[PDB]
């Protein structure tokens, strides 16, 4: 299936003319992964923009955060431009400082993801990364075929010897899976292009001990997963899923055994050691900064909170202790440093409409809410 990109543009800090800041563009909900994203200043692409490593969500749809240092002024216009197969022409979302542009059992998860993009018989690409929940802990350098340790504690309690062995295994695996798929696909060219995603790792749920998983998607839909010792086809992907599970269950018992030990024995060890080593960083508290803005629609009042970590937060418009319903909660969006951003909108009538305020509540604030008066 294909999914059109969602595009959201925001600044890391409140805009102050002449003062340096970061411009962020979050591109999400898209499929396939092939995408072009630029940040524009007055219609011209900014060089030396950075971006997060390609990731994807629960529904397999891809997400990327683009960011650059910028200095807003009164006059300068910034935007995010995206092109993608779902779009007949590039889509430009402007940054507006006033309004921007655009589960159950509690658990932690360590997992590796892979994205395999098969463009044609002569061209395929494998990429991947490691994640503690939504935090990236590991990258993968394609050229050298090596693990990139992103944090000082990214080795968990694993030895360099163990990590080197895993690294070599992953290198052989990425190359081999890509080639094996290309060999099957070279017998019918009209299947091209297509994409394969893997998510594999282990989860610690409250009340349970670690559980491994290995999940696969094809063109953005569940294809199959590893259940106990059996590759099980997604009910959703019918005949192709059945074929692939038959291959995996009957011609690759060595692969099966390797996946089993990795997700059921090595991954739990890795997860527990990683949480432990990264304790201080993962359970840190970072206070949000907060500010108000408005635009005409009747005003929209907009309350912003940016720079908070961890993610749970509560932001609401209040008319003297009365919480205003009619408040639109935006998405919680990432900043490049791992903190988060949120705006909350209230549509109002009249002028300055007596005592409106915005209340920001967050674990980091030591029981002292930020209250901003309009």
């Amino acid at each position, epitope marked *: 299936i294909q999914r059109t990109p969602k595009i959201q543009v925001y600044s890391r800090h409140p805009a102050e003319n002449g003062k340096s800041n970061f411009l962020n563009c979050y591109v999400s909900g898209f499929h396939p992964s092939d995408i072009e994203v630029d940040l524009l200043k007055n219609g011209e692409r900014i060089e030396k923009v950075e971006h997060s490593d390609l990731s994807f969500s629960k529904d397999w749809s891809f997400y990327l955060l683009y960011y650059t240092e910028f200095t807003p002024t009164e006059k300068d216009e910034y935007a995010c431009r995206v092109n993608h197969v779902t779009l007949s022409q590039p889509k430009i979302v402007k940054w507006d400082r006033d309004i921007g542009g655009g589960g159950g059992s509690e658990h932690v998860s360590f997992h590796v993801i892979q994205i395999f993009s098969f463009v044609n018989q002569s061209w395929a690409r494998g990429q991947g990364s490691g994640w503690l929940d939504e935090l990236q802990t590991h990258g993968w350098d394609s050229e050298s*075929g090596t693990i990139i340790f992103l944090h000082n504690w990214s080795k968990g309690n694993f*030895s360099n*010897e*163990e990590l080197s*062995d*895993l690294e*070599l*295994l992953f*290198r*052989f*695996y990425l*190359f*081999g899976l890509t*080639r094996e798929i290309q060999d099957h696909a070279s017998q019918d060219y009209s299947k091209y292009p297509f994409e394969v995603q893997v998510k594999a790792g282990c989860e610690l749920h409250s009340g349970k001990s670690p559980e491994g998983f290995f999940q696969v998607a094809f063109n953005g839909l569940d294809l199959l997963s590893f259940q106990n010792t059996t590759w099980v086809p997604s009910p959703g992907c019918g005949s192709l899923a059945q074929s692939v599970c038959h291959l995996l269950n009957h011609q*690759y*018992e*060595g*692969v099966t*055994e*390797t996946v089993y*030990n*990795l997700i059921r024995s*090595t991954c739990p060890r890795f997860l527990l050691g990683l949480l432990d080593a990264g304790k201080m960083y993962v359970h840190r508290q970072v206070r949000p900064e907060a500010w108000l803005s408005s635009r005409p629609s009747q005003l929209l009042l907009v309350c912003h909170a940016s720079g908070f970590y961890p993610k749970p937060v509560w932001v609401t418009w209040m008319r003297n202790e009365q919480e205003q319903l009619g408040t639109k909660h935006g998405d919680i969006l990432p900043n490049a440093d791992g903190t988060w951003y949120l705006q909350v909108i209230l549509e109002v009538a009249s002028e300055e409409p007596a005592g409106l305020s915005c209340r920001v509540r967050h674990s980091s604030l030591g029981g002292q809410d930020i209250i901003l008066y309009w």
Partner: T-cell receptor, first 111, second 115 residues
Framework: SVTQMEGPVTLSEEAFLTINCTYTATGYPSLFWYVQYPGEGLQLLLKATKADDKGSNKGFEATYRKETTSFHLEKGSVQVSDSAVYFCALSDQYGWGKLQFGAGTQVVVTP | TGVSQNPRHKITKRGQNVTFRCDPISEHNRLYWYRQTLGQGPEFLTYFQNEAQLEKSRLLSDRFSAERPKGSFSTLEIQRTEQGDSAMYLC?????????????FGQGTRLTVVE
């Protein structure tokens, strides 16, 4: 990653053969013995891909013992045609890696 | 039937380049070069998966280079041979039959570098 007994080991036809091999590994290696007869290339004798698996061939055996990290070669009653060089080996990367060989042990079986 | 290496023997003067060839069992995706000196175990030199050289020994001299252009035959070249290069150069290949797959060895190329 693989240490084996220094030879040569000389023994009489029908004597018991033991060649010690110990390994060091963090992961899930596959273990093996290769043999090289005089004038010949290397060839697999036997192997074991997991803890407690036993490989056996022509009276030789070796048991993968994870807790002593060992894969000792044994044969109850050696024959003259067993005169050769024996190499302990391991494949890391969960049994997908290159063979890493010990230094080898010459066995001389006298008639 | 098995892995084929050429030449079976090579005598060369110190300073000259040599190239050796391996033809693995066809259909084997994994190919490995090793060096063995009299009375010792093979030392790993390099590994190909198909055409891709996915692992080289950290100790491999910069004088040594291998290639496997079509995921089939491979060549090992030694530039400016030295006496210490004298050894049996082994090629082996393995199928993807699973964990602990058998490696099939050639009869080797015996190199003697003479003054």
């Amino acid at each position: 990653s693989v240490t084996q007994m220094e030879g040569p080991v000389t023994l009489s036809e029908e004597a018991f053969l033991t060649i010690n091999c110990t390994y060091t590994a963090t992961g899930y290696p596959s273990l093996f013995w290769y043999v090289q007869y005089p004038g010949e290339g290397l060839q697999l004798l036997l192997k074991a891909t997991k803890a407690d698996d036993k490989g056996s061939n022509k009276g030789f055996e070796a048991t993968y013992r994870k807790e002593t990290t060992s894969f000792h070669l044994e044969k109850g009653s050696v024959q003259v045609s067993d005169s050769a060089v024996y190499f302990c080996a391991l494949s890391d990367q969960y049994g997908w890696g290159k063979l890493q060989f010990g230094a080898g042990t010459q066995v001389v079986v006298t008639p | 039937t098995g892995v084929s290496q050429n030449p079976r023997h090579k005598i060369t003067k110190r300073g000259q380049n040599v190239t050796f060839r391996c033809d693995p069992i066809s259909e084997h995706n994994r190919l490995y070069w090793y060096r063995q000196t009299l009375g010792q175990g093979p030392e790993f030199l390099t590994y190909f998966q198909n055409e891709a050289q996915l692992e080289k020994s950290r100790l491999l001299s910069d004088r040594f280079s291998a290639e496997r252009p079509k995921g089939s035959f491979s060549t090992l070249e030694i530039q400016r041979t030295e006496q210490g290069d004298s050894a049996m150069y082994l090629c082996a290949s393995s199928p993807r039959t699973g964990r602990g797959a058998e490696a099939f060895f050639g009869q080797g190329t015996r190199l003697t570098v003479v003054e």
